């Protein structure tokens, strides 16, 4: 029983969650941010952190330094809707008047890092990854979605002398939703960088492969009988909505995606005090970090606007913005539905990978 008082709980400390937490902190609204890690992960830069020595420490930002007693590390195992509690592993419970679900996506390392561990262990996992890439003359990237084409491009840009093969199950690279001109340019850039492309092939012995580790010899097989000898296998095979925290409680209002259905105010269907932001919300746009932060502004604003009996802010998508960095010197993509070239993408994304915007949000300075 909050007896009218606000206490917001944010489940997930990603791009959406740290934006929500930062705004709630500036409004002096009581809240608790929950994340399984001890630091925010700027995962847009996770592939650069897999190939550049010393870079990983720029991609993890301590929660407690920024949020102090408004942060609690923990693993959310469920949501008790009748008694308005967030259920943590270990048995602890967090009461809320409003709930913001910002649980993001899960997938293979290095592109995603969803482990309970300390900031130094997380940084070391990416430094270890860099050392496996450095030891490995021959490298296979599996999956030619937008992550795989970035992974392969990063390796060949930092290490032109390595042999890199990208194996992709479709005939075209990167998102089906992209302008065809963008998808063709991605292909032409990988080929000009010397990446060997095996298109329309599915790697078929994934269970038998050592992953993210150098070996003197690894044989990759595909369903068409192609065999590739390599020293290192990196998986960029896709991601899944991380419905872990809320799956049982909200099974009624889940999309196929695993996301939560929401109106244009980002309240979860059937609720007025539960919001979903970022990857876990069921919007028609693609899963983007910058959209996560914009949903965060909308959700917090609507919590306040609901208390002030004011009209709620509305989320209105426009045409697709999607930028692919192709190593630090190259890239291609589209901004609001039209093509942008390699100089533009290099300057906007490939050089810094938006890293400074997260340190600014967290009001910390990178080491
Ligand atoms: C992999 C990748 C992604 C890119 C890339 N580029 C861009 C880009 O240029 N622009 C962009 O907007 N998005 C880009 N993205 C997408 C961006 O990474 C994601 O869209 C973004 O992370 C989504 O932000 P969310 O806030 O929705 O989710 P996160 O995954 O960031 O965070 C969720 C958090 O919840 C925590 N969590 C989840 N379930 C939990 C539970 N049960 N208990 C506790 N904590 C939990 C997780 O540990 C994690 O900390 C990119 O180059 C790469 C290589
Ligand atoms: N630059 C950006 O904006 C950016 C970059 C990365 C990711 N993202 C976001 O994350 C989402 C996921 O992207 P992603 O690339 O991680 O996944 P994805 O699902 O877009 O691509 C993974 C691909 O790997 C293929 N694959 C799976 N197993 C395979 C196998 N054994 N052999 C060969 N191919 C195999 C899949 O069929 C799929 O085409 C994007 O749709 C977007 O929302 C954005």
Is 268 contained in some domain?
A: yes
Locate 211 and state its tokens. Answer: 């992953």
Residue nearest to atom 17 of ligand 2 (CA): 238
- Residues in contact with ligand 1 (CB, 6 Å cut-off): 12-17, 34-37, 43-44, 47, 75-76, 102-105, 111, 114, 147, 150, 242, 244-245, 278-279, 287-290, 292, 323, 349
31-35/39-41 β-pairing: unpaired
What range defines the domain where residue 92 resides? 8-36+74-107+239-317
Q: Are 334 and 197 in contact (CB under 8 A)?
A: no
Provide the CATH number for the domain around residue 191: 3.50.50.60
Sign of CA dihedral 65, 70, 74, 77: negative
CA angle (94, 14, 271) in 5-degree steps: 50
Residue 279 Cα: closest atom of ligand 1:
27
For this entry, resolution in Å reads: 2.0
Residue keyed to tokens 């917001």? 8
Q: Between the CA of residue 45 and those of 199, 217, 292, 349, 352, what are the distances in Å?
A: 26, 29, 16, 10, 8
Method for structure elucidation: X-ray
Closest CA to 195 of 164, 220, 161: 164
> Are both 264 and 228 inside the same structural domain?
no
Residue nearest to atom 35 of ligand 1 (CA): 12
Q: Are 114 and 122 in contact (CB under 8 A)?
A: no
Residue 48, marked binder:
yes
Domain boundary among 300, 317, 334: 317
Output the CA 289–ligand 1 centroid distance in Å: 6
Residue 76, marked binder:
yes
Sign of CA dihedral 38, 44, 47, 53: negative
> Are both 213 and 333 inside the same structural domain?
yes
Three-state SS at 85: strand
> Are both 220 and 277 inside the same structural domain?
no
* H or E, element range at 282: none
How crowded is residue 206: how many other Cβ atoms within 10 Å of its Cβ?
14
Q: Which residue among 45, 146, 208, 289 has the greatest number of ligand 2 atoms within 8 angstroms of its CB, and so is best to mutate?
A: 146
How far apart CA 307 and CA 273 sit, in angstroms, is 11
* H or E, element range at 337: none
Q: How many domains does the chain have?
A: 2
């Amino acid at each position: 029983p909050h007896m009218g008082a606000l206490h917001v709980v944010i489940v997930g400390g990603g791009f959406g969650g740290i934006a929500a937490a930062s705004q709630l902190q500036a409004l002096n609204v009581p809240f608790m941010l929950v994340d399984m890690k001890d630091s925010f992960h700027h995962n847009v830069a996770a592939l650069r952190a897999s190939v550049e020595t010393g870079f990983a420490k720029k991609t993890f930002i301590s929660y407690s330094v920024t949020f102090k007693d408004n942060f609690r590390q923990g693993l959310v195992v469920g949501i008790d809707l009748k008694n308005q509690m967030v259920l943590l592993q270990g048995g602890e419970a967090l009461p809320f008047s409003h709930l913001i679900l910002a649980t993001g996506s899960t997938g293979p390392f290095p592109g995603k890092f969803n482990e309970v561990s300390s900031q130094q262990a997380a940084i070391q996992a990416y430094e270890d990854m860099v050392r496996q890439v450095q030891r490995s003359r021959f490298i296979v990237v599996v999956g030619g979605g937008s992550a795989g084409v970035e992974m392969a491009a990063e390796i060949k840009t930092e290490y032109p002398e390595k042999e890199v093969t990208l194996i992709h199950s479709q005939v075209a690279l990167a998102d089906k939703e992209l302008l065809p001109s963008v998808r063709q340019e991605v292909k032409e850039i990988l080929l000009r960088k010397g990446v060997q492309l095996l298109l329309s092939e599915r790697v078929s012995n994934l269970e038998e492969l050592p992953l993210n580790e150098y070996r003197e010899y690894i044989k990759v097989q595909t369903d068409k009988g192609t065999e590739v000898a390599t020293n290192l296998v990196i998986l960029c095979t896709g991601i899944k909505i991380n419905s872990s925290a809320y799956r049982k409680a909200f099974e009624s209002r889940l999309a196929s995606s695993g996301a939560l259905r929401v109106n244009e105010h980002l309240q979860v269907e059937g609720h007025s005090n539960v919001y979903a932001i970022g990857d876990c919300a069921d919007v028609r746009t693609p899963k983007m970090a910058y959209l996560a932060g914009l949903h965060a502004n909308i959700a917090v604003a609507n919590i306040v606007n609901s208390v002030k009996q004011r009209p709620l802010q509305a989320y209105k998508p426009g045409a697709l913005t999607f930028l692919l960095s192709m190593g630090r010197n190259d890239g291609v993509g589209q901004i609001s539905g039209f093509y942008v070239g390699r100089l533009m993408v290099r300057l906007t994304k490939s050089r810094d990978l938006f890293v400074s915007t997260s340190w600014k949000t967290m009001r910390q300075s990178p080491p």
